A paper describes a structure:
The covalent modification of Lys residues with the 76 amino acid protein ubiquitin (Ub) constitutes one of the most important cellular signals, most commonly targeting the substrate protein for proteasomal degradation. Most recently, based on mass spectrometry and following from earlier findings that PINK1 phosphorylates the Parkin Ub-like (Ubl) domain (Kondapalli et al, 2012), three groups showed that Ub itself is a substrate for PINK1, which phosphorylates Ub Ser65 exclusively, in vitro and in cells (Kane et al, 2014; Kazlauskaite et al, 2014; Koyano et al, 2014). We here show that PINK1 is a Ub and polyUb kinase and reveal wide-ranging consequences of Ub Ser65 phosphorylation. PINK1-mediated phosphorylation of Ub at Ser65 has dramatic consequences for Ub structure, and key processes in the Ub system, namely Ub attachment and removal.
The new Ub crystal form (space group P1) contains eight phosphoUb molecules in the asymmetric unit (Fig3A). Unambiguous electron density is observed for phospho-Ser65 in all molecules (Fig3C). The phosphate group forms a hydrogen bond with the backbone amide of Gln62, but no other contacts (Fig3D). In wt Ub, the same hydrogen bond is formed via the hydroxyl group of Ser65 (Fig3D). It is also clear that in the major phosphoUb species, the main Ub interactions sites, the Ile44 and the Ile36 patches, are structurally intact and extensively utilized in crystal lattice interfaces (Fig3). The obtained high-resolution crystal structure and solution studies agree that the majority of phosphoUb is structurally similar to wt Ub. As crystallization of phosphoUb did not provide information on the more intriguing minor species of phosphoUb, this was further investigated using a variety of solution NMR techniques.
Residue numbers in the entry: 1 to 74
The structure:
Amino acid sequence: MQIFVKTLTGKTITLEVEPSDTIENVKAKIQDKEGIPPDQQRLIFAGKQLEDGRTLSDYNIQKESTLHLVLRLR
């Protein structure tokens, strides 16, 4: 399915994913487009911080829905 990842910098990217994809897996695809290391990414959906080892289906993330990407640096 297609999902969207919003950076609060203003911009958005599309991602191509499966419901069984892990957040880890999503982070890797974000790094491929944005260059941000996975341990400096945090993803937010429906007011929850998403865990690395869990899947999109675990969080009821559906086609054309949107995740929010936040930086955790120092």
